[PDB]
Write a protein that binds this ligand. Structure first.
Ligand SMILES: Cc1cc2nc3c(=O)[nH]c(=O)nc-3n(C[C@H](O)[C@H](O)[C@H](O)COP(=O)(O)O)c2cc1C
Ligand SMILES: Cc1cc2nc3c(=O)[nH]c(=O)nc-3n(C[C@H](O)[C@H](O)[C@H](O)COP(=O)(O)O)c2cc1C
Lengths: 337, 337
């Protein structure tokens, strides 16, 4: 058998949910409980492994709730936790009694706090937590990654002139755009380094990594002529480095502070290729290793060898600029005065 | 009045706790509940602001529990949540009844999950959460920081030779040492960047920032002759850059991913000074701005001007090396073969 636990955010209607679960959970011989408290669901489900999983994939796509996080998975259990409840619904709001109110209030406060912490988490950890894996004890492994690096053109002159709030508005907008597109193509964001976005793709995701690069460049171009001139967003440009190689993926740090990152020379290479694009007529630079993972009929352009042994640099025709890097940089400064 | 909520980890004895709280919580006219479940405390406390705070400082130093996190603070409440319980203790393990078991199990699972997420958190966020501040809505502010940067000497040759697990053992040991010392002197760690540790100190913490730098250098020296030669730890060296200036402190990112970092040119400067020490006869390099925040009678040594306008670089005599940077680097490589 098998048992999992998840939480989710909602979007008499819950009564239609439990009427169903009961019938289907006997049809497939399942038990568990559904709690509702302050617009959040909590569910425990237990039963034969194939039957419990056929159900939770159905649950994942139910549009009655969002931001689903599976906290816990127990494999090959032997004793059910609620053998007599096909699916028991406990509306924790209807309960007004004294002795459940403390536990009611704490469940609310921990889970809400929890939901806030989730947004500062490494995507990989949240993924591990969903798959039942313990992030703190997982063993760091050597994996093959495409490494992605993007940051803001002449950002230090954007921070130089704008007031703090426009800086933040601008950085957050940049980060929204980057992560939405990376995540849509199947990449994972590793972390933010100042103005920089570090991500990874798999070795079957070369095309998706170039497409990600071009799309970001594209949305920033549209964004610049969508807004008025006096909007700092009018001044937002990026350059993107891709590398490929082996990296160590895992957790690092002491008891008092943990991080779940990627170590390996390819990390440095993508960052240097990213910075290389400030001297290139292209916004995207990548290695030959990235090119090998690319199946699509890209028009690859060779930018020669660069720097402790030199490496070959490539780009695609679609990453060409219609601007000069020191032109944009003096233009940014002239605008802000 | 005022009300807070915290959780902590434990180290009939709980019976001695509640017997006390009751008497003192009436003495100072306080109410709330204490839950115990699977080696974790949960407490809600409410009352007049001066009285509730005199108590929680006492609680913080009680050695019966550790890893105390205050989740929630409510200011100037008007209605108490438990007006009749000076301090009601609910041992959630003693309860075996059916209808509390689901809520019992969920409270356990969320809070445990919670505890795991806390270890991937920005120190500043955990601090904000403790002080009652909402991290997601706090407004990013411009602050004066000493910026700290440390990373591992010729790390790319350590990753080149050692197997993955020795890399991780070695990085984790480095990070334990760095964060323990930074945190002891009063700094905060911002994040980890690969082999790099980024931290900040206040402008009244110059001496503490140099002391932090020297102590780390010191512990790594001791560590190298404490271990056998064949231990990768025998090969672990660091360089440290300090800068000073204005940075933006706050949260950045989209709904789907949030980070709580420091933006500003001083971040880049400390990183470049850090890298500068690979060509210097010292392991610590800092700006004149850092020197100004230093009150202690340091023997400051001037390393000239470096690089887009050049800045003056300083170090202290105590940061001198007894090694050559390219000697250690070829020595590391020779060892590993
Ligand atoms: C929070 C939540 C929990 C649910 N739990 C169950 C459950 O335990 N068992 C179940 O059969 N359906 C559950 N559902 C509803 C599923 O969508 C359901 O399996 C589906 O409507 C079945 O459709 P079908 O019989 O046509 O295949 C749940 C829905 C929600 C929102
Ligand atoms: C989890 C926990 C909760 C506590 N809650 C209270 C409380 O609510 N009120 C209280 O007076 N003491 C509480 N204490 C114990 C304090 O240490 C206590 O105030 C102290 O022993 C008083 O000493 P004094 O009367 O000599 O000043 C708590 C201790 C623990 C571990």
């Amino acid at each position: 058998m098998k048992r999992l636990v998840f939480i989710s955010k909602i979007s008499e209607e819950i009564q239609r949910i439990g009427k169903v679960s009961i019938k289907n959970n006997q049809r497939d011989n399942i038990t568990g409980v559904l709690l509702y408290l302050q617009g959040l669901f909590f569910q425990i489900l237990e039963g034969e492994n194939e039957k419990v999983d056929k159900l939770y994939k159905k649950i994942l796509v139910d549009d009655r709730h969002t931001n689903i996080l599976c906290l816990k998975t127990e494999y090959d259990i032997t004793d059910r936790m609620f053998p007599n409840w096909a699916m028991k619904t406990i509306n924790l709001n209807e309960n007004s009694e004294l002795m459940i109110q403390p536990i009611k209030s704490l469940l609310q406060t921990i889970t809400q706090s929890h939901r806030v912490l989730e947004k500062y988490m490494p995507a990989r950890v949240i993924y591990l937590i969903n798959q039942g894996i313990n992030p703190l004890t997982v063993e760091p492994q050597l994996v093959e990654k495409i490494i992605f690096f993007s940051d803001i053109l002449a950002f230090s002159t954007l921070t130089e002139k704008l007031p703090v709030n426009e800086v933040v508005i601008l950085v957050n907008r940049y980060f929204s755009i980057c992560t939405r597109i990376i995540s849509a193509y199947g990449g994972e964001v590793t972390k933010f380094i100042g103005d920089c976005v570090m991500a990874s793709f798999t070795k079957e995701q070369g095309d998706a990594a170039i497409r990600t690069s071009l799309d970001i460049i594209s949305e920033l171009k549209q964004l610049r002529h969508h807004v008025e001139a006096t909007n700092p967003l009018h001044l937002l440009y990026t350059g993107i480095g891709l590398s490929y190689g082996h990296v160590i993926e895992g957790n690092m740090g002491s008891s008092l502070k943990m991080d779940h990152t990627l170590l390996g020379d390819a990390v440095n290479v993508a960052a240097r290729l990213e910075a290389l694009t400030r001297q290139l007529p292209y916004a995207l630079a990548f290695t030959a290793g990235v090119k090998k993972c690319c199946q699509a009929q890209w028009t690859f352009i060779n930018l020669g060898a660069h720097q402790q042994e030199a490496i070959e640099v490539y780009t695609v025709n679609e990453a060409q600029k219609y601007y000069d890097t020191l032109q944009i940089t003096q233009l940014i400064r002239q605008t802000l005065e």
